[PDB]
Amino acid sequence: MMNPLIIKLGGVLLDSEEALERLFSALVNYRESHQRPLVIVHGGGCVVDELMKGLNLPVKKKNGLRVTPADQIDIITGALAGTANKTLLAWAKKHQIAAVGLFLGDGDSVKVTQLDEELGHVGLAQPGSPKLINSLLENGYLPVVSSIGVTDEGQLMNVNADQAATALAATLGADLILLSDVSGILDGKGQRIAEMTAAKAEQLIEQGIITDGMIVKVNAALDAARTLGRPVDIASWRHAEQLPALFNGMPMGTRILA
Amino acid sequence: MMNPLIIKLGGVLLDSEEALERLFSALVNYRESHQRPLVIVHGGGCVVDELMKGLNLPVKKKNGLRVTPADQIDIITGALAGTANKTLLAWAKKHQIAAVGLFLGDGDSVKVTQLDEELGHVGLAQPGSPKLINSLLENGYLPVVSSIGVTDEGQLMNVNADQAATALAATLGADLILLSDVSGILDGKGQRIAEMTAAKAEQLIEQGIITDGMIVKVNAALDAARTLGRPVDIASWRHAEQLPALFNGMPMGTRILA
Ligand SMILES: Nc1ncnc2c1ncn2[C@@H]1O[C@H](COP(=O)(O)OP(=O)(O)NP(=O)(O)O)[C@@H](O)[C@H]1O
Ligand SMILES: Nc1ncnc2c1ncn2[C@@H]1O[C@H](COP(=O)(O)OP(=O)(O)NP(=O)(O)O)[C@@H](O)[C@H]1O
Ligand SMILES: CC(=O)N[C@@H](CCC(=O)O)C(=O)O
Ligand SMILES: CC(=O)N[C@@H](CCC(=O)O)C(=O)O
Ligand SMILES: [Mg+2]
Ligand SMILES: [Mg+2]
């Protein structure tokens, strides 16, 4: 087996049937034309915000991470580990892909602990064991992994999905692509930045250009590049014609260099 | 590998920390003292009703099955495939059990189709492929399987969990135990019925003694007994002292005979 490729999916993609169809088309074409085994990691913040909206609950993000009280972890788990993961497994079945849905605790794939009492049930993700997912890959399944985990003491944890993808890339020795609703990291004028180093990201954060979850996204991508010794791309899932080349390694967004 | 044992869990069990602790204690003791491999299937109607309650949505059951409109399948999936399944995987991690969470579509373990347009997205469960779960069992994992499935065309389906457990028992050739909040099937005076045949269940249904989901439960148990050629028990998860003997084969509730 080749090193796998993790494709991380998030943003408003799940709210778009058309975008899901175009993505699954491109995944089936990549899978039928590449020996490298695919793994999907996903977020779903929008699914949570909608269920929180319907419940009249506030959305507080502290430094790009969603504060997750003990009274909200069950609902967030339902939206992310349930609705978002099973919507993706249904698109995979429609496209004749044998997928297996997982969260971070299955096979201890990604180790999670409480990151900060000020955040509640938000996890810090770190590498775990590759045995279960390697076994699924060797048997021809596509793992589809949500960003909920669980601590050794049994408490469910909400992990930001970019950090969960980075931890899983380190666990499997996988290449990584972070797909979002924007074409990579944007500069002060809203233009795509083609390449990113740690020095440059420090400068942009100092200048207040990179903010919110983007700060979390870039730092997760940088950690992955240094840990794997390979570039990591941040790119958009929006434009159909770009998907095939993107999955083949062409630079469509921001290439993070370590 | 021995034929597995499926333990189906539902009712208000998930709302009871104390009952969950006593159950997981008993599962760990059974696992460490028995070569027979365990599989858990679960429902979670109460988790759904609570999230529907908080959303101001009605609960309509038509012949013991929950009508599941297209505008409710995502929320029901979140509660059952997400919150209930991951709460069980967290109790398994707390007890040092390596579990893997699945729904019915993973490995095509249980085939699901639309049962009736009058019910919406309710599935009819039928046997599927045992390969994925047999592989997990041989590698020492405890599968924990929710009762959401997916059709070949990609539509998520809500399956009653007793029928999903019966279909999975036929797929794996497994023994089955249906655990509920009541001590088996009760007669007209609210007393436990020790043994049940198809003739007797027909009589009780004719007399209006067995109703609602109990009709669905008994018919699922009868189908499983005839299909496996082995008795199937319906019993309570409520009383701690009875759990060990129950998992060892002692009659604690209603033994359905085919
Ligand atoms: N300098 C910046 N460049 C690009 N995007 C930025 C920047 N600063 C902030 N953002 C924001 O970063 C968001 C990207 O992160 P995020 O909103 O969490 O999406 P996601 O991770 O793709 N989705 P999900 O997994 O569901 O959370 C964009 O849509 C912008 O609102
Ligand atoms: N004759 C009867 N004997 C016993 N229980 C009966 C009878 N008639 C109706 N019931 C009902 O059957 C219920 C059992 O089915 P059900 O309510 O769906 O629980 P469950 O399947 O254990 N849980 P879950 O998986 O979460 O749905 C009982 O609690 C009774 O309300
Ligand atoms: C802690 C944390 O922010 N979690 C994310 C997980 C989903 C994602 O990355 O989209 C969240 O929105 O709640
Ligand atoms: C269709 C159907 O009734 N589904 C069940 C699944 C959960 C269970 O059995 O508890 C339900 O309540 O919605
Ligand atoms: Mg994000
Ligand atoms: Mg029931």
Indicate which atom in ligand 3 lies nearest the CA of residue A76.
Answer: 13
Whose tokens are 């998930």? That residue is B14
Interface of B with A in 46-65 (CB under 8 A): 51, 54-55
Domains recognised in chain A with CATH numbers: 1-258 (3.40.1160.10)
Buried b / exposed e along B203-234 (16+ C-beta atoms within 10 A): ebeeeebbeebbebbbbbbbbbbebbebbbbb
Q: Please name the member of B86, B151, B153 whose beta carbon is closest to the beta carbon of A81.
A: B86
Task: Please work out whether the CB of residue B160 comes within 6 Å of at least one atom of ligand 4.
Answer: yes
Alpha carbon of A212 to ligand 1 centroid (Å) = 7
Degrees, nearest 5: CA angle B100-A142-B89? 15
Cα separations in angstroms, B50 against A24, B57, B166, B186: 34, 10, 26, 26
Q: Is B182 annotated as a binding residue?
A: yes
State the Rg of chain B over Cα: 17
Query: What is the distance in A from the centroid of ligand 5 to the CA of B89?
Result: 25
- Decide if A11 is catalytic: yes
Residues of A in contact with B155 (CB under 8 A): 90
Instruction: Please choose, from the candidates B243, A254, B235, A19, the residue with its C-alpha nearest in 3D space to the C-alpha of residue A27.
Output: A19
User: How far, in Å, CA of A170 to CA of A166, rounded?
Assistant: 6
B217 is catalytic: yes
To the nearest whole Å, the CA of B66 is away from the closest chain A CA by: 18
In the residue annotation, A45 being an active-site residue is answered as yes
CB A194 within 8 A of CB A136: no
Residue A117 neighbours by CB under 8 Å, 6+ apart: none
Residue B99: list chain A partners with CB under 8 A. Answer: 106
Asked if B19 has any chain A CB less than 8 Å from its own CB, the reply is no
CA pair distance A219, A205, nearest whole angstrom: 11
Both tokens of A198, joined, read 């740690």
Q: Is B182 on the interface with A (CB under 8 A)?
A: no
- Give the integer Cα–Cα distance in Å for B162 and A155: 28
Contact flag A82-B77 (C-beta cutoff 8 Å): yes
Q: What is the CA radius of gyration of chain A?
A: 17
Tokens for A220, please give them.
């997760």
- From the centroid of its chain, how far is CA A178? 6
What's this structure's resolution in Å? 1.5
Query: For ligand 1, what atom is nearest to the CA of residue A161?
Result: 25
CB of A181 less than 8 A from some CB of B? no
Beta bridge partners of B9: B42, B179
Nearest partner of A103 among A31, A43, A193, judged by Cα: A43
Method of structure determination: X-ray
